[PDB]
Coordinates of C-alpha atoms (C1' of nucleotides) and ligand atoms in Angstrom, one line a residue:
Chain A
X1 CA -5.4 244.1 147.8
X2 CA -5.7 241.5 144.9
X3 CA -4.4 241.2 141.3
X4 CA -5.7 239.4 138.3
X5 CA -5.2 239.1 134.4
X6 CA -8.2 240.1 132.4
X7 CA -8.7 240.0 128.6
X8 CA -8.8 243.2 126.6
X9 CA -12.3 244.8 126.6
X10 CA -13.6 242.0 128.6
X11 CA -15.2 241.4 132.1
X12 CA -17.9 239.6 134.1
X13 CA -17.7 235.8 133.8
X14 CA -18.2 233.7 136.9
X15 CA -15.1 231.5 137.3
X16 CA -12.2 234.2 136.2
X17 CA -13.2 237.3 138.0
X18 CA -16.6 237.8 139.9
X19 CA -16.0 235.4 143.2
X20 CA -12.1 236.0 143.2
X21 CA -12.4 239.8 144.0
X22 CA -16.0 239.4 144.9
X23 CA -15.4 237.7 148.3
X24 CA -13.2 240.9 149.1
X25 CA -16.3 243.3 149.2
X26 CA -15.7 244.9 145.8
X27 CA -18.6 246.1 143.4
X28 CA -18.1 243.8 140.5
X29 CA -19.7 245.8 137.5
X30 CA -17.7 249.1 138.2
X31 CA -14.3 247.0 138.1
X32 CA -15.9 245.2 135.2
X33 CA -16.9 248.2 132.8
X34 CA -14.5 251.1 133.9
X35 CA -11.8 248.2 133.0
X36 CA -13.4 247.7 129.8
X37 CA -13.5 251.6 129.3
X38 CA -9.6 251.9 130.2
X39 CA -8.6 248.6 128.4
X40 CA -10.7 249.1 125.4
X41 CA -7.5 250.3 123.9
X42 CA -5.6 247.1 124.6
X43 CA -5.8 244.8 121.5
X44 CA -8.5 241.8 121.6
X45 CA -7.2 238.7 122.9
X46 CA -4.4 239.9 125.2
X47 CA -4.8 239.3 128.8
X48 CA -3.7 242.8 130.5
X49 CA -2.8 242.5 134.2
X50 CA -5.0 244.7 136.7
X51 CA -4.0 245.5 140.2
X52 CA -7.1 246.0 142.2
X53 CA -6.7 248.2 145.4
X54 CA -9.6 247.8 148.1
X55 CA -10.0 250.0 151.2
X56 CA -12.1 249.4 154.3
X57 CA -15.0 251.2 152.7
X58 CA -15.1 248.9 149.7
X59 CA -14.3 251.8 147.2
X60 CA -11.4 250.5 145.1
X61 CA -8.8 252.2 142.8
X62 CA -7.1 249.9 140.3
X63 CA -4.0 250.4 138.3
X64 CA -4.4 248.6 135.0
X65 CA -0.8 247.9 133.8
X66 CA 0.7 246.9 130.5
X67 CA 0.1 243.4 129.1
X68 CA 2.3 240.8 130.4
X69 CA 5.9 239.9 129.1
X70 CA 4.4 236.4 127.7
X71 CA 1.5 238.2 126.2
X72 CA 3.4 240.8 124.3
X73 CA 5.7 238.1 123.3
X74 CA 2.9 235.7 122.0
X75 CA 1.9 238.7 119.7
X76 CA 5.4 240.2 118.8
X77 CA 6.3 236.6 117.4
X78 CA 3.1 236.4 115.8
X79 CA 2.2 233.2 117.7
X80 CA -0.8 232.0 119.8
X81 CA 0.5 229.7 122.4
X82 CA 4.3 229.6 123.4
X83 CA 6.3 226.3 123.7
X84 CA 5.2 223.4 125.8
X85 CA 9.0 222.6 125.5
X86 CA 10.9 225.9 125.9
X87 CA 14.4 226.1 124.3
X88 CA 13.9 222.5 123.2
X89 CA 11.0 223.2 121.0
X90 CA 10.9 226.8 119.9
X91 CA 7.8 228.3 118.6
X92 CA 8.4 232.0 117.2
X93 CA 10.6 235.0 116.7
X94 CA 11.3 238.4 117.5
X95 CA 13.9 240.9 116.4
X96 CA 15.7 243.4 119.0
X97 CA 13.0 246.1 118.0
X98 CA 10.2 244.1 119.4
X99 CA 12.3 243.1 122.6
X100 CA 12.6 246.9 122.8
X101 CA 8.8 247.6 122.1
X102 CA 7.6 245.2 124.7
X103 CA 10.2 246.7 127.0
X104 CA 9.1 250.2 126.6
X105 CA 5.5 248.9 127.4
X106 CA 7.2 247.3 130.4
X107 CA 9.6 250.2 130.8
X108 CA 6.4 251.7 132.2
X109 CA 6.0 248.3 133.8
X110 CA 9.4 247.0 135.2
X111 CA 12.2 247.7 137.9
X112 CA 14.9 248.0 135.3
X113 CA 17.6 250.7 135.1
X114 CA 17.9 251.1 131.4
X115 CA 15.8 249.9 128.4
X116 CA 18.6 247.3 128.2
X117 CA 17.6 245.8 131.7
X118 CA 13.8 245.9 130.6
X119 CA 14.9 244.4 127.1
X120 CA 16.9 241.7 129.0
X121 CA 13.8 240.9 131.5
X122 CA 11.8 240.5 128.2
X123 CA 14.9 238.5 126.9
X124 CA 14.4 236.2 130.1
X125 CA 10.7 235.9 129.3
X126 CA 11.8 235.3 125.7
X127 CA 13.8 232.3 126.7
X128 CA 11.0 231.1 129.3
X129 CA 8.3 230.2 126.7
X130 CA 10.6 229.0 123.9
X131 CA 10.5 232.0 121.4
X132 CA 13.6 232.8 119.6
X133 CA 15.3 236.4 119.6
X134 CA 16.2 237.3 115.8
Chain B
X1 CA 19.3 185.2 136.8
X2 CA 22.7 184.2 135.9
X3 CA 23.9 180.7 135.4
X4 CA 26.5 179.0 133.4
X5 CA 25.4 178.1 129.7
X6 CA 26.9 174.9 129.9
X7 CA 29.2 173.1 132.1
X8 CA 31.8 170.4 132.2
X9 CA 30.3 168.7 135.2
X10 CA 26.9 169.0 136.5
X11 CA 27.9 168.7 140.4
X12 CA 30.7 170.1 142.6
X13 CA 32.5 169.5 145.9
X14 CA 31.3 171.9 148.7
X15 CA 34.8 173.1 149.0
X16 CA 35.9 175.8 151.3
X17 CA 36.0 179.4 151.2
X18 CA 39.5 180.7 152.4
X19 CA 41.9 183.3 152.0
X20 CA 41.3 186.7 150.4
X21 CA 39.9 188.0 147.0
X22 CA 41.4 188.9 143.7
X23 CA 40.2 192.0 141.7
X24 CA 40.3 194.3 144.8
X25 CA 40.3 197.4 142.5
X26 CA 37.7 199.1 140.3
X27 CA 38.7 198.6 136.7
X28 CA 36.0 200.0 134.9
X29 CA 33.8 202.3 136.5
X30 CA 34.5 205.3 138.8
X31 CA 33.0 203.6 141.9
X32 CA 32.4 200.0 143.3
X33 CA 30.7 198.1 145.9
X34 CA 33.5 196.0 147.7
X35 CA 32.7 193.1 150.1
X36 CA 34.5 193.3 153.5
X37 CA 32.9 189.9 154.7
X38 CA 33.1 186.3 153.3
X39 CA 30.2 184.5 152.1
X40 CA 28.3 182.9 149.1
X41 CA 25.9 184.8 146.7
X42 CA 23.3 183.0 145.2
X43 CA 22.2 184.3 141.6
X44 CA 19.0 185.5 143.2
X45 CA 20.8 187.6 145.6
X46 CA 23.0 189.2 143.0
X47 CA 19.8 189.7 140.6
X48 CA 17.8 191.4 143.1
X49 CA 20.5 193.7 144.0
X50 CA 21.3 194.6 140.4
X51 CA 17.8 195.4 140.0
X52 CA 17.8 197.6 143.2
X53 CA 20.6 199.7 142.0
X54 CA 19.1 199.8 138.3
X55 CA 15.7 201.6 139.9
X56 CA 18.1 203.7 141.8
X57 CA 20.1 205.5 138.8
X58 CA 16.9 205.8 136.8
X59 CA 18.6 203.7 134.2
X60 CA 21.4 206.1 133.6
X61 CA 25.2 205.9 133.8
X62 CA 26.4 202.2 133.7
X63 CA 26.6 199.1 136.0
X64 CA 29.0 196.3 135.8
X65 CA 28.5 192.9 137.7
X66 CA 32.1 191.6 138.6
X67 CA 31.0 188.5 140.2
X68 CA 29.6 185.3 138.5
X69 CA 27.6 182.5 140.4
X70 CA 29.3 179.5 138.7
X71 CA 29.3 176.8 141.3
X72 CA 26.3 174.5 141.8
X73 CA 24.7 173.7 145.2
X74 CA 22.6 170.7 145.6
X75 CA 19.9 169.9 148.2
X76 CA 18.2 166.6 148.9
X77 CA 14.3 167.2 149.4
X78 CA 12.5 166.8 152.8
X79 CA 12.0 163.5 154.3
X80 CA 14.7 161.7 152.5
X81 CA 17.3 159.6 154.3
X82 CA 21.1 160.0 153.8
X83 CA 23.0 158.3 151.0
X84 CA 21.3 157.2 147.7
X85 CA 23.6 159.6 146.0
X86 CA 24.3 163.3 145.9
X87 CA 21.5 165.9 146.1
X88 CA 19.8 167.4 142.9
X89 CA 21.2 170.8 141.8
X90 CA 19.1 173.6 143.4
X91 CA 20.7 176.7 142.4
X92 CA 23.9 178.7 141.7
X93 CA 26.4 180.6 143.9
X94 CA 29.6 182.8 143.6
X95 CA 32.1 182.3 146.2
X96 CA 33.1 185.6 147.9
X97 CA 36.2 186.6 149.9
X98 CA 36.8 189.6 151.7
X99 CA 37.9 192.5 149.3
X100 CA 36.0 191.5 146.0
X101 CA 34.2 194.0 144.1
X102 CA 30.9 193.2 143.4
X103 CA 29.7 195.8 141.2
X104 CA 31.2 198.7 139.4
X105 CA 29.4 201.8 138.5
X106 CA 30.0 205.2 136.5
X107 CA 28.8 208.1 134.6
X108 CA 27.0 209.2 137.6
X109 CA 27.2 211.7 140.6
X110 CA 28.9 210.3 143.6
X111 CA 26.4 211.0 146.2
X112 CA 23.8 209.2 144.3
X113 CA 26.2 206.2 144.0
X114 CA 26.7 205.9 147.4
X115 CA 22.9 205.8 147.8
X116 CA 22.2 203.3 145.1
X117 CA 24.9 201.0 146.7
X118 CA 23.5 201.1 150.0
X119 CA 20.0 200.1 148.6
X120 CA 21.9 197.4 146.6
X121 CA 23.7 196.0 149.6
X122 CA 20.3 195.8 151.5
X123 CA 19.8 192.7 149.4
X124 CA 23.1 191.1 150.1
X125 CA 24.0 188.5 153.0
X126 CA 27.5 190.1 153.5
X127 CA 29.5 193.1 155.0
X128 CA 30.0 195.7 152.1
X129 CA 31.6 199.0 151.6
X130 CA 31.9 201.8 149.2
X131 CA 35.0 202.4 147.2
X132 CA 36.5 204.7 144.5
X133 CA 39.0 203.7 141.6
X134 CA 42.5 205.1 142.1
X135 CA 45.4 206.2 139.8
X136 CA 47.7 203.2 140.5
Chain C
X1 CA 56.0 219.1 146.8
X2 CA 55.8 215.9 149.0
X3 CA 58.4 215.1 151.6
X4 CA 58.4 211.6 153.3
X5 CA 60.5 210.9 156.5
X6 CA 61.8 207.3 156.7
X7 CA 63.7 205.0 158.4
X8 CA 66.1 202.2 157.3
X9 CA 64.7 198.6 158.0
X10 CA 66.9 196.6 160.6
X11 CA 64.6 193.6 159.8
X12 CA 62.8 191.7 157.1
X13 CA 60.4 189.1 156.4
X14 CA 56.6 188.4 157.2
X15 CA 56.9 188.7 161.0
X16 CA 59.0 192.1 160.9
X17 CA 56.3 193.5 158.3
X18 CA 53.4 192.5 160.5
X19 CA 54.9 194.1 163.7
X20 CA 55.6 197.1 161.5
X21 CA 51.8 197.3 160.4
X22 CA 50.9 196.8 164.1
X23 CA 52.7 199.8 165.2
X24 CA 51.0 201.7 162.7
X25 CA 54.1 201.9 160.3
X26 CA 54.6 200.1 157.0
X27 CA 57.3 198.9 154.8
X28 CA 58.3 200.2 151.4
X29 CA 61.2 200.0 149.0
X30 CA 63.6 202.2 146.9
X31 CA 65.1 200.6 143.8
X32 CA 66.2 201.5 140.4
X33 CA 69.3 202.9 139.1
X34 CA 72.9 202.1 139.4
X35 CA 72.6 201.5 143.2
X36 CA 71.5 198.8 145.5
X37 CA 68.1 198.6 146.8
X38 CA 67.1 200.5 150.2
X39 CA 64.2 199.1 152.3
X40 CA 62.6 201.6 154.5
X41 CA 59.6 202.1 156.9
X42 CA 57.2 205.0 156.9
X43 CA 54.3 206.5 159.0
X44 CA 51.2 204.9 157.7
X45 CA 49.0 208.0 158.3
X46 CA 51.3 210.6 156.7
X47 CA 51.5 208.7 153.7
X48 CA 47.9 207.8 153.5
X49 CA 46.9 211.2 153.7
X50 CA 49.7 212.5 151.1
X51 CA 48.6 209.7 148.3
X52 CA 45.1 211.1 149.1
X53 CA 46.1 213.5 146.5
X54 CA 46.6 212.6 142.7
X55 CA 50.0 214.2 142.0
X56 CA 51.7 211.7 144.6
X57 CA 51.6 209.1 141.7
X58 CA 52.6 211.6 138.8
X59 CA 55.4 213.5 140.6
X60 CA 59.0 213.4 141.7
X61 CA 58.9 213.3 145.6
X62 CA 61.7 213.3 148.1
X63 CA 62.5 210.9 151.0
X64 CA 64.6 211.9 154.0
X65 CA 66.6 208.9 155.3
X66 CA 69.1 209.3 157.9
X67 CA 69.8 213.2 157.1
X68 CA 69.8 211.9 153.3
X69 CA 67.2 212.7 150.6
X70 CA 66.5 210.7 147.8
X71 CA 64.3 211.8 144.8
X72 CA 61.9 209.1 143.7
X73 CA 58.6 208.3 141.9
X74 CA 55.7 206.0 142.9
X75 CA 55.9 202.7 141.2
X76 CA 53.2 200.6 142.4
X77 CA 51.5 200.0 145.7
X78 CA 49.6 197.2 147.1
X79 CA 46.9 198.1 149.6
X80 CA 45.1 195.9 152.3
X81 CA 42.0 194.3 150.7
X82 CA 39.0 196.0 152.5
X83 CA 40.7 198.4 154.7
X84 CA 41.6 202.2 154.2
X85 CA 45.1 200.9 154.3
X86 CA 48.6 200.6 152.4
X87 CA 50.5 197.3 152.7
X88 CA 53.5 198.6 150.5
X89 CA 55.0 200.9 148.1
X90 CA 57.5 200.5 145.3
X91 CA 59.6 203.5 144.8
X92 CA 61.6 203.9 141.7
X93 CA 64.7 206.1 141.8
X94 CA 64.1 209.4 139.8
Chain D
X1 CA 28.7 232.4 152.4
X2 CA 31.6 234.9 152.0
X3 CA 35.4 233.9 152.0
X4 CA 38.1 236.1 153.5
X5 CA 38.9 237.1 149.8
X6 CA 35.3 238.0 149.2
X7 CA 35.2 240.4 152.0
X8 CA 38.7 241.7 151.0
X9 CA 37.4 242.6 147.6
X10 CA 34.3 243.9 148.9
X11 CA 36.0 246.3 151.4
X12 CA 38.1 247.4 148.3
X13 CA 34.8 248.3 146.3
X14 CA 33.4 250.2 149.3
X15 CA 36.7 252.1 150.0
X16 CA 36.8 252.6 146.3
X17 CA 33.4 254.4 146.0
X18 CA 34.0 256.1 149.5
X19 CA 37.1 257.7 148.1
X20 CA 35.3 258.9 144.8
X21 CA 32.3 259.9 146.6
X22 CA 31.4 263.6 147.7
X23 CA 28.9 262.9 150.7
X24 CA 27.3 259.9 152.4
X25 CA 24.5 259.0 154.6
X26 CA 24.2 256.1 157.1
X27 CA 20.6 254.9 158.1
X28 CA 18.6 252.0 159.6
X29 CA 17.4 249.6 156.7
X30 CA 15.2 247.3 159.0
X31 CA 11.5 246.8 158.7
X32 CA 11.0 247.7 155.0
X33 CA 9.9 245.8 152.2
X34 CA 12.0 245.1 149.0
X35 CA 9.5 246.9 147.0
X36 CA 10.0 250.3 148.5
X37 CA 13.7 249.5 148.8
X38 CA 13.9 249.1 144.8
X39 CA 11.6 252.1 144.8
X40 CA 14.5 253.9 146.5
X41 CA 17.2 252.2 144.4
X42 CA 15.3 253.6 141.4
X43 CA 15.1 256.9 142.9
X44 CA 18.8 256.2 143.7
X45 CA 20.0 255.7 140.3
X46 CA 18.1 258.6 139.2
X47 CA 19.7 260.9 141.7
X48 CA 23.3 259.5 141.0
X49 CA 23.2 257.8 144.4
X50 CA 25.1 254.7 145.1
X51 CA 23.0 252.5 147.6
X52 CA 24.4 249.9 149.8
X53 CA 23.7 247.5 152.8
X54 CA 27.2 246.4 153.9
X55 CA 28.5 244.5 157.1
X56 CA 29.5 246.7 160.0
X57 CA 33.0 245.3 160.9
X58 CA 33.6 245.5 157.2
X59 CA 32.6 248.9 156.9
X60 CA 35.1 249.8 159.8
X61 CA 37.8 248.4 157.5
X62 CA 36.5 250.2 154.3
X63 CA 35.9 253.6 156.3
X64 CA 39.3 253.4 157.8
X65 CA 40.0 254.5 154.2
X66 CA 39.3 258.1 155.2
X67 CA 37.8 260.7 155.9
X68 CA 34.7 258.8 157.0
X69 CA 36.3 257.5 160.4
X70 CA 33.8 259.7 162.4
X71 CA 31.0 257.2 161.3
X72 CA 32.6 254.1 163.0
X73 CA 30.1 254.5 165.8
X74 CA 27.3 254.8 163.5
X75 CA 27.8 251.2 162.4
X76 CA 26.3 249.9 165.5
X77 CA 22.9 248.6 164.3
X78 CA 21.9 247.6 160.8
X79 CA 23.7 249.7 158.1
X80 CA 22.4 250.9 154.9
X81 CA 24.6 253.8 153.4
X82 CA 23.9 256.4 150.4
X83 CA 27.0 257.5 148.7
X84 CA 26.3 260.4 146.2
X85 CA 28.8 260.2 143.6
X86 CA 27.1 262.8 141.5
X87 CA 26.3 266.1 143.6
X88 CA 26.6 266.1 147.3
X89 CA 23.0 266.1 148.9
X90 CA 20.1 264.2 146.9
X91 CA 21.0 261.2 149.6
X92 CA 20.1 263.4 152.9
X93 CA 17.2 265.1 151.3
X94 CA 15.8 261.6 149.7
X95 CA 16.2 259.7 152.9
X96 CA 14.2 261.9 155.3
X97 CA 11.3 262.0 152.8
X98 CA 11.5 258.3 152.4
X99 CA 11.7 257.7 156.2
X100 CA 9.0 260.1 156.8
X101 CA 7.0 258.4 153.9
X102 CA 7.6 254.9 155.3
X103 CA 7.7 256.0 159.1
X104 CA 9.7 253.0 159.5
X105 CA 13.5 252.8 160.4
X106 CA 15.8 255.7 161.5
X107 CA 18.4 257.3 159.3
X108 CA 20.9 258.1 162.1
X109 CA 24.1 259.8 161.4
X110 CA 25.5 261.6 158.3
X111 CA 29.2 262.4 157.3
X112 CA 30.4 265.5 155.3
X113 CA 33.8 267.6 155.2
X114 CA 35.3 265.0 157.3
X115 CA 32.7 265.4 160.4
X116 CA 29.6 263.5 161.4
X117 CA 26.3 265.3 161.4
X118 CA 23.8 264.4 164.2
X119 CA 20.3 263.1 163.1
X120 CA 18.2 266.5 163.5
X121 CA 20.9 268.6 161.8
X122 CA 21.0 266.4 158.7
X123 CA 18.6 269.0 157.2
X124 CA 22.2 270.9 156.4
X125 CA 22.2 268.4 153.7
Chain E
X1 CA 4.1 204.3 168.0
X2 CA 5.9 202.3 165.5
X3 CA 7.9 200.0 167.6
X4 CA 10.9 198.6 165.8
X5 CA 14.5 197.7 165.8
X6 CA 15.6 200.2 163.0
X7 CA 14.4 203.7 163.9
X8 CA 15.1 207.0 161.7
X9 CA 14.4 210.6 161.0
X10 CA 11.3 210.5 158.6
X11 CA 11.7 214.3 158.0
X12 CA 13.5 217.5 159.2
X13 CA 11.3 217.9 162.5
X14 CA 12.0 214.4 163.8
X15 CA 14.4 214.6 166.7
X16 CA 16.2 211.6 168.2
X17 CA 16.4 210.9 172.0
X18 CA 17.5 208.3 174.4
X19 CA 15.0 208.3 177.3
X20 CA 15.6 205.8 180.2
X21 CA 18.1 203.7 177.9
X22 CA 15.5 203.5 175.1
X23 CA 16.1 205.1 171.6
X24 CA 12.9 207.0 170.3
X25 CA 12.2 209.5 167.6
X26 CA 10.1 212.5 168.4
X27 CA 8.1 214.7 166.1
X28 CA 6.4 218.1 166.9
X29 CA 4.9 217.9 163.1
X30 CA 3.7 214.4 162.6
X31 CA 2.4 212.1 165.3
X32 CA 2.6 209.3 162.8
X33 CA 6.7 209.4 163.1
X34 CA 6.7 208.9 166.8
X35 CA 8.8 205.8 167.4
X36 CA 10.4 203.5 169.9
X37 CA 13.1 200.9 169.6
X38 CA 12.1 197.3 170.4
Chain F
rA1 C1' 22.3 227.8 167.9
rG2 C1' 18.9 231.6 169.5
rC3 C1' 16.2 236.2 168.9
rC4 C1' 14.9 241.5 165.4
rA5 C1' 14.3 242.3 160.1
rG6 C1' 13.4 241.3 154.7
rG7 C1' 12.6 236.6 151.5
rA8 C1' 11.7 241.5 145.9
rU9 C1' 10.3 242.7 139.5
rG10 C1' 9.2 240.7 134.6
rU11 C1' 5.2 237.2 136.1
rU12 C1' -0.4 234.1 136.7
rG13 C1' 7.4 232.1 132.5
rG14 C1' 5.0 229.0 128.6
rC15 C1' 2.5 224.3 128.1
rU16 C1' -2.1 222.0 130.2
rU17 C1' -6.5 222.7 132.5
rA18 C1' -13.7 224.6 134.0
rG19 C1' -8.9 226.3 137.5
rA20 C1' -2.0 225.4 137.7
rA21 C1' -1.2 232.1 140.0
rG22 C1' 6.7 229.1 142.9
rC23 C1' 4.1 224.6 144.9
rA24 C1' -1.7 218.5 139.8
rG25 C1' 1.0 217.7 135.6
rC26 C1' 5.1 218.9 131.0
rC27 C1' 9.5 221.8 129.7
rA28 C1' 12.5 225.8 130.1
rU29 C1' 14.6 228.0 134.9
rC30 C1' 16.3 233.4 132.4
rA31 C1' 17.0 238.3 133.4
rU32 C1' 16.2 242.7 136.4
rU33 C1' 16.6 245.9 141.5
rU34 C1' 20.1 243.2 144.7
rA35 C1' 22.6 242.9 151.5
rA36 C1' 20.1 238.9 150.0
rA37 C1' 15.4 236.6 147.5
rG38 C1' 15.2 228.7 144.2
rA39 C1' 10.7 230.7 137.5
rA40 C1' 11.0 227.9 144.9
rA41 C1' 12.2 223.7 150.0
rG42 C1' 7.2 222.1 152.5
rC43 C1' 1.7 223.4 154.7
rG44 C1' -2.3 225.8 151.8
rU45 C1' -6.6 227.1 147.9
rA46 C1' -12.1 225.4 143.5
rA47 C1' -7.3 228.3 141.6
rU48 C1' -5.5 232.4 144.8
rA49 C1' -4.6 234.2 149.1
rG50 C1' -2.6 232.9 153.7
rC51 C1' 2.3 230.1 156.5
rU52 C1' 7.8 228.7 157.0
rC53 C1' 12.2 227.5 154.3
rA54 C1' 16.6 228.5 150.9
rC55 C1' 19.6 233.4 151.3
rU56 C1' 21.1 238.1 153.5
rG57 C1' 21.6 242.5 157.2
rG58 C1' 21.3 243.2 162.4
rU59 C1' 22.1 241.4 168.2
rC60 C1' 25.4 237.8 170.2
rG61 C1' 30.3 236.6 171.6
rA62 C1' 34.3 231.9 171.0
rG63 C1' 35.1 227.9 169.3
rU64 C1' 31.5 224.8 165.7
rC65 C1' 30.5 221.2 161.7
rG66 C1' 30.6 215.8 159.9
rG67 C1' 32.9 212.3 158.0
rC68 C1' 37.3 208.3 158.5
rC69 C1' 39.8 204.9 161.7
rU70 C1' 39.5 202.3 166.2
rG71 C1' 38.6 200.7 172.4
rC72 C1' 34.5 199.5 175.9
rG73 C1' 29.3 199.6 176.1
rC74 C1' 23.0 200.1 174.3
rG75 C1' 18.8 198.4 171.4
rG76 C1' 17.6 194.1 168.0
rA77 C1' 16.6 189.9 172.6
rA78 C1' 9.8 185.6 173.7
rG79 C1' 8.4 179.4 176.8
rA80 C1' 6.5 176.1 179.1
Ligands
LIG1 MG1 41.6 171.9 149.1
LIG2 MG1 42.3 182.4 142.4
LIG3 MG1 64.0 184.3 154.5
LIG4 MG1 54.4 183.4 160.5
LIG5 MG1 8.8 205.6 182.8
LIG6 MG1 23.6 232.5 163.3
LIG7 MG1 38.4 221.7 163.5
LIG8 MG1 21.4 193.2 174.1
LIG9 MG1 8.5 190.5 175.3
LIG10 ZN1 8.7 214.2 161.4

RNA sequence: AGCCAGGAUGUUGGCUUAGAAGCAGCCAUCAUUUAAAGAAAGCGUAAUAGCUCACUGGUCGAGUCGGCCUGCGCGGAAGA
């Protein structure tokens, strides 16, 4: 029962993926290319989280979830890297429509009651990496 | 290390330390280190201490030093008989009577200040306590 | 509101005062106004815990002396040099 | 911690949703993750259900606010109450399937109409 | 066994004791915190 | 105080790094479901995982916490 964050159409380098979930009994290339077959639709350069579920027989089922609050906030403000000094140094900007798009993606991925709760959790990740909401 | 820029006379009578202190109260900072016991503070002591509580506050808030080492102490060196004058001036001291306020402080959290003052007092010869400025 | 109970001082001087302070009581005074001064004694503890609030110094309090209140303010107070103690209090008639 | 004022206000909020609620279900909350509990909180805000875990001797003071007083012996043991403010049922049908899904805790005693329902007969709701 | 005239709690698991008229500091966690007065 | 239970999502917050995922280091430290759950008080990893803590519900059943001021004692305390 492991989790990783893997770039869009990508898999099978040695340090990020193979050892981590490969010491758990998982076949590495089925995860790799069924995850690049599922996440071929995610834009190039966004890490997308993947939850791997392993069973006593090593046959696994993974739910690929929507890209992180921090990655959809990197892309919706246009930027590459967020702030090394958040809310002191501010690195980009998103109007409330992008807070709400990222929070519809994460409306599929949150615990929130309303799209205002998911927009407010994406508001929180918007204040975390320094980005301004405008 | 504190010491009078220039003096009227070079040497002094040993004098006594008697009676109680003036400046019993904290007139600048919110907190102060008061002396309970009676003794002489060399400049070295005061300096080391001021250092201690300067490390302790990470150079924040503010620190006053209310005491000054203005009276010169002498010593004849080893292997020297009595007489032949008064000894040479070794170092400077401040006479301390019970209830003087050695350092004042403010712009800081109280807890932190009690701490810094414990660390400051580790370097001092005499019995000391923590105190707060009051209204009247 | 602060109410301080007190007795009239039958004695005076350094000796009286230091016997007062030994007994866990302390001397204070009430002056100001048309009247004559009134020297009184108090319980060190009650007052020490009472001036442990700030308003004590900014406010009109009352002092119960032989059935009779007076309304006063805190004028100045001399404290023992290193001890959590009170040597004396100047009360000015309010 | 909680001041007496804190406890007083909270007793007023439980008594206030208790007056407004159509039906309630008391259950054991022990031995279940906050993941499945936020799952029954989503399945709660979706069913109109008001979910709570409240102190016992607090809930004797709030349930003294009537007509749930038949539940004051159901408060021995950890208490998780589901008030359905919208619809009756949808708490009692959701809890049996959540406790059979988890196979943890209990779901002990319900209350409707002013009477308590024993554990195997909560299938009435 | 740090043997000294000032003995203290060096963490939250250190527990002070007086055994046979000696003040010691005993730790479950850290053998290095074992102290006696002297 | 003990003992049962949980200590959640966004999320591996961004920075940085071959790796930093609460726990090298730099900066922010928000919001959600909340009974409660620090962008985490320590052990832990190549980095994770793994282990307690803060915090809260349960059982328990009446006093408990730590400063202040003093009285008398303990350690500090070895020599022909
Ligand atoms: Mg003289
Ligand atoms: Mg003078
Ligand atoms: Mg006379
Ligand atoms: Mg005399
Ligand atoms: Mg023995
Ligand atoms: Mg307890
Ligand atoms: Mg008490
Ligand atoms: Mg001895
Ligand atoms: Mg010996
Ligand atoms: Zn220890």
